[PDB]
Design an enzyme around this catalytic site. Structure first.
Site, mmCIF file in Angstrom:
data_model
loop_
_atom_site.group_PDB
_atom_site.id
_atom_site.type_symbol
_atom_site.label_atom_id
_atom_site.label_comp_id
_atom_site.label_asym_id
_atom_site.label_seq_id
_atom_site.Cartn_x
_atom_site.Cartn_y
_atom_site.Cartn_z
ATOM 1 N N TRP A 97 -4.604 -45.712 -10.314
ATOM 2 C CA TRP A 97 -3.164 -45.501 -10.360
ATOM 3 C C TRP A 97 -2.601 -45.110 -8.997
ATOM 4 C CZ3 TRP A 97 -5.902 -43.746 -14.807
ATOM 5 C CH2 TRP A 97 -5.507 -44.346 -16.023
ATOM 6 N N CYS A 125 1.251 -42.234 -11.732
ATOM 7 C CA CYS A 125 0.440 -42.822 -12.791
ATOM 8 C C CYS A 125 1.020 -44.139 -13.294
ATOM 9 C CB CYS A 125 0.264 -41.823 -13.947
ATOM 10 S SG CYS A 125 -1.020 -42.238 -15.143
ATOM 11 N N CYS A 126 1.690 -44.094 -14.439
ATOM 12 C CA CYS A 126 2.257 -45.290 -15.036
ATOM 13 C C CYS A 126 3.768 -45.410 -14.970
ATOM 14 C CB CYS A 126 1.838 -45.387 -16.500
ATOM 15 S SG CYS A 126 0.121 -45.772 -16.763
#
Ligand SMILES: [Cl-]
Ligand SMILES: [Cl-]
Ligand code: NA
Ligand code: NA
Lengths: 759, 759
Positions: free
Chosen positions: B333, B418-419
């Site tokens: 990530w 991260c996402c």
């Protein structure tokens, strides 16, 4: 209501009480101890095994005193509870076992407190610290030391350098914690782990409900570490071939189990003071039962107590030369509180009380354990005399006012930690704070905060006194404003210190033998009370001329006219000391503290009287620069000349109500000053302490008393011929030390102190 | 006067602003970046050195994918910033240097988080953990993992085992922190250490005054560790022959300095997500200056960006098989936020924006860095198309709504961690919380708290739902109560977790590149939203009858009729999913949190959709036991059949106002569904995202979009012939992964997902 078969058997014959259903050592003692009012005629002598063992140990003690260094110490092993293999003096002779390392007197490495001190010790004693240990405790595991210095302020650092705030627990274990080791003997490890798990669980609700979140999480983790420690206690004892999972079934096991509890503590924490607590009476309950059942003879009883006390004479910690001067004589403070009265009226004195004092005769005089007699006017006359006799013969005992502390705590199961700091066993501890230099605080007031020895701005930047002669009103006005500052820096330093100590060196194995919630106090000490007090007396009762330098900085003073001195029963000077204690206590009292530790005060110095006096210049009282202050609350060297009664009355006037952490007083008196023969001496000494500790509603009374019965010439002879007095012991500041364990300078301090010639 | 001689040399040509007097990376970017609205025609190709290096690295990547294990990893060295010597792929060819260890792809040991996971990895991959490392991190240095489990409740432990609360950061670094690495390139280490020392000092007053004592002491210590970390950054770079004490004087140094900042992070912390931040535009400022000055050619510029991005393709962490199933595909990530619009109106898109996307062409497709395009309707049409082209060719990009987040934060310098979790660079972080199983929370409501597989009590003991047919209002009323319970256990677990992580694994080197006070959020995730939502739709609009076992436990369901499913733009069902998000968010919102971290929510799962679905039995929606949930906020496998517009509209209906931590949506579409040729496809794809991310005052719009342009058959062929698709990459849950890096079961999840056939 079926009691565990293990508990019922071990407790065969013991009276019933709440103590069988919950952890309550005090109740067990109350329902089972046999009060003893008789004399010393029952006391036995040392066995062959006892002497053989002690003499062997004395060989290492002689080496220590001679080389003023450790016999040996670890260089590559990080000490924990389970780190070392069993160690013995002679496995075949020891009735009670357990040593800190695998060899007698071999000191260990307790790295959690800081790696720098270990390095310093290693350098000083000519040994090399294992590189791996160093790497671990500098890069992986952060230590108490490094955490403190990461948060310290440059202001505090300055006070540390100048000698205004020095020797605080930032470079050694804080100590001042007494786990109730008696709990192990009574309940066994298993029962205690089951009790801790309950304490741990009782906090789950508050956690899930967000009630005091961080404080709850912390307590849960601490209790979890306490639980783990109790398990390691078993593993430790297991190495010696013992199973302490269940309760002690006899006397030998009660002594062994209790010591094993203490052993775990001294194997994991290197606190300045690692006290034993109030155990003599407790252990008596087990000895009595074994005697009555004819399973143990009176001599075997002494042997057991001897071997225990002998182990307490063998506790050692690796210290730095810096520590050695702040806390002189290789002290441990394995304090034992003996005797005292109960809340119900009966005396807590027992046959074991005599057995413990008897170790001074069976194995000769010894600094450790720091045996403290909880004095009361209601004590059996028989014990009062024997205690005095022992003091006359060895000068190894100390006395503290039970008539004052018992009612104050309203508890008959409190113990003395270190020198004079009282605590209810297993329910209360202290946040050690060492002591601040009050004397230098006065000189700072007069010099506008600039250090009279370093000529640097330490205290706040203010204008120095412009006067030609000192005026009490003017000086005190500054003294107050500077004390406010001293109080803030002192409290702030301690807050940082204890936050870091709870984080990097939480005394898991000692707190595991405490209740779930422990009462905490922020113990602050005052050093040089008399120097400060007398200096004030020389300004309100005489003429003082400030001899300034090329900057206006008072580096000396001129005195014309006799002025009052603390220690002569003269209210004019005594009233000033009592005022100082009160002022400072009221000051630190208004400040916020870590964990809400209730700030308390103490007039205690240890060897800080030497170190601070060394860093303090000429004072208004006439004391020359570099000269030592008086130990604890003592009057300055030789200043108390109106005999015992006078000097005792001045120290007793000091408010214990404003110094809850203690008031230390070292009292030395010549053999002849007490009488023509021992009988007269014992009676008179006891009488002195009765008058000194006398408590009443309008008279508080003295809190502490070190008793030395000797002649200055004997010590002078000891300085010339060390090998002639191997076991010579003296009270020096709230604890005892072998005379040969002190440095030439530390001895110099002693011999120049007040030797009471009359009464 | 904040302008040194070197600072002026390095900043030669740069526009003036506040950024020269304080730490303000955002201002520097605003005053210096050159907006670019042109196309891709300027893009260069890979150099010989680039290909030589990448091909060599691909050889190790092939080994990884084949063996589904590390190429190699440490077994006897505890990793820190300065622990490893310089490591190279080929010292002579690398324009930008720096590896985690001394060898490419060799994973390290980050023990501070826990020693058990390291042991587990060591046995899984057939290697022997050094006994010394183990001893240190179990007996001396306590780890994050051990602290958590010492405070955890047996209730939480049960939720972990049953699959209601699993995969929380109690066994790996929390991550979710993005230090502003651009600060190193801009100011240099020295300027940052002086700035930190100022921050440290600014807290002295509050400390001395007892204002928030413990919080102050903590912050002082943290800042002290941050300061120490910055110094180790220098030492680290020094091993590579670089001096980063001063600011980056050119383009190569800006890239190198920024990477060195990140390298320190990935050498000391093994967080689940170790994102890069918003750097492409920032670095452009230095590249532009070097091009304009004719120091660097356009090809040399790409080479530099290539070598940096290549290093980001080489970040690795030693993980356990357990971690491998919770977070599939060996993800890092290392998120890069590209493009976006400024607050003033101009686009943040630059030539470097294109250069970064170009790494997909110069070095082939790659999962890492997780390149995220901050989408805006006002973006230059040229960039919108190129971005879509890249997505069509590689399926390696992801899109997030800049039109939504920028106004929300009212900041044009926020990044994606991260996402889909947004944060203002250097001023805000998250307390990662993984995700809770909402689906199982429903089954618990129906079964009175008893787990449908383990058949033990997990949730609160309550009476199971009666009747032969399920009734919405009742089922929902019970769920609402169980969600209260889930919220309490979840928050409590995270409170313990983050208290322990701040204590035993404080990300010193990342926080050192943040402001003094950082905004914190308690990121809570929801897994199986669609399974829960659809189950309610079935219960509400159809006839769901429970098939109970002998004990009355609902282990299956029968459905009579058809009901609306999520992702078909049917409000009857979508409103339910929206309702669930809102309910949970309002619940966790009323609870106390560690460090007062503002609780936020996110509909994100990662591979927890597989793990949780595996531990969840038959659900009211018809989903069979053991079957995977939908990745993130996706509709259950194949359920969305009304084309793109329909499924995009359902996910966009989800309130980002109640899921501030993000809403992940993986969207896959066949090449032909977008058009007959690339030009039509690019135009249409861009158009889809314009409609999807469309923001307005009465229309919130979608927050995230993973774009996969492929055919199911191509993946089926990839499963049979791995060696034919070495660099094949796909979006799977908010990040990308090489198809060959997944397990047979994880691939099974992918191929059975929705492949949009129309619009
Ligand atoms: Cl526990
Ligand atoms: Cl600092
Ligand atoms: Na008193
Ligand atoms: Na939305």
């Amino acid at each position: 209501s079926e009691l565990n078969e293990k508990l019922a058997t071990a407790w065969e014959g013991f009276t019933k009480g709440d103590w069988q259903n919950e952890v309550n050592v005090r109740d067990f003692i109350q329902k089972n101890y046999t009060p003893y009012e008789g004399d010393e005629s029952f006391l036995a002598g040392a066995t062959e095994a006892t002497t053989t063992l002690w003499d062997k140990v004395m060989e290492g003690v002689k080496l220590e005193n001679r080389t003023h260094a450790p016999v040996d110490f670890d260089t590559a092993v990080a000490s924990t509870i389970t780190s070392h293999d069993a160690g013995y003096i002679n496995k075949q002779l020891e009735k009670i076992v357990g040593l800190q390392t695998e060899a007698p007197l071999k000191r260990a490495l307790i790295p959690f407190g800081g790696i720098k001190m270990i390095e310093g010790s290693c350098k000083a004693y000519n040994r090399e610290l294992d590189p791996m240990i160093k790497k671990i405790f500098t890069e992986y595991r952060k230590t108490h030391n490094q955490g403190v210095f990461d948060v310290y302020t440059p202001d505090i650092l300055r006070c540390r350098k100048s000698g205004v705030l020095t020797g605080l627990p930032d470079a050694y274990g804080r100590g001042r914690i007494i786990g109730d080791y008696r709990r192990v003997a009574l309940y066994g490890i298993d029962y205690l782990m089951k009790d801790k798990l309950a304490q741990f669980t009782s906090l789950q609700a508050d956690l899930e409900n967000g009630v005091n979140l961080e404080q709850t999480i912390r307590l849960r983790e601490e209790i979890a570490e306490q639980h783990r420690a109790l398990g390691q206690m078993k593993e430790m004892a297991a190495k010696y071939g013992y199973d302490i999972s269940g309760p002690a079934t006899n006397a030998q096991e009660a002594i062994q189990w209790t010591y094993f509890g203490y052993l775990a503590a001294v194997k994991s924490q290197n606190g300045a003071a690692m006290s034993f607590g109030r155990t003599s009476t407790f252990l008596d309950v087990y000895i009595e039962r074994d005697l009555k059942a004819g399973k143990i003879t009176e001599q075997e009883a002494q042997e057991m107590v001897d071997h225990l006390v002998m182990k307490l004479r063998m506790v050692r910690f690796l210290r730095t030369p810096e520590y050695d001067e702040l806390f002189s004589g290789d002290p441990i403070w394995a304090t034992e509180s003996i005797g005292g009265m109960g809340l119900d009226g009966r005396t807590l004195v027992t046959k074991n009380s005599f057995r413990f004092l008897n170790t001074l005769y069976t194995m000769g005089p010894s600094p450790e354990p720091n045996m403290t007699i909880l004095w009361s006017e209601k004590l059996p006359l028989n014990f009062k005399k024997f205690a005095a006799k022992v003091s006359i013969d060895t000068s190894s005992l100390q006395y503290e006012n039970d008539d004052l502390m018992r009612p104050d705590f309203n508890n008959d199961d409190y113990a003395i930690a270190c020198c004079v700091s009282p605590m209810i066993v297993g329910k209360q501890m202290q946040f050690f704070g060492a002591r601040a230099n009050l004397a230098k605080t006065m000189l700072y007031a007069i010099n506008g905060g600039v250090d009279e020895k370093l000529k640097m701005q330490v205290g706040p930047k203010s204008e120095p006194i412009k006067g030609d002669v000192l005026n009490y009103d003017e000086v005190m006005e500054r003294m107050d404003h500077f004390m406010d500052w001293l109080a803030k820096q002192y409290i702030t330093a301690l807050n940082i210190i204890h936050y870091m100590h709870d984080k990097y060196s939480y005394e898991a194995s000692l707190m595991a033998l405490h209740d779930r919630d422990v009462i905490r106090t922020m113990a602050c000490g005052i050093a040089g009370l008399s120097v400060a007090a007398d200096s004030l007396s020389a300004i309100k009762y005489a003429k003082v001329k400030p001899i300034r330098d090329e900057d206006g900085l008072a580096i000396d003073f001129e005195i014309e006219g006799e002025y009052p001195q603390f220690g002569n029963n003269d209210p004019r000077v005594d009233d000033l000391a009592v005022d100082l204690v009160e002022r400072f206590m009221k000051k630190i009292q208004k400040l916020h503290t870590y964990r809400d530790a209730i700030p308390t005060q103490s007039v205690l110095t240890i060897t800080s009287n030497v170190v601070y006096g060394k860093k303090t210049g000429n004072t208004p009282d006439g004391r020359r620069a570099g000269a030592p202050f008086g130990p604890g609350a003592n009057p300055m060297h030789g200043r108390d000349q109106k005999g015992a009664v006078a000097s005792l009355t001045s120290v007793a006037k000091l408010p214990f109500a404003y110094a809850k952490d203690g008031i230390s007083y070292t009292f030395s008196i010549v053999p002849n000053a007490l009488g023509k023969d021992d009988e007269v001496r014992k009676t008179n000494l006891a009488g002195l302490m009765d008058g000194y500790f006398h408590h009443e509603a309008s008279i508080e009374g003295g809190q502490h008393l070190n008793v030395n019965v000797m002649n200055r010439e004997m010590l002078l002879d000891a300085m010339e011929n060390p090998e002639k007095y191997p076991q010579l012991t003296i009270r020096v500041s709230g604890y005892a030390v072998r005379f040969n364990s002190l440095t030439k300078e530390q001895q110099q301090d002693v011999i120049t102190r007040t030797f009471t010639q009359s009464m």
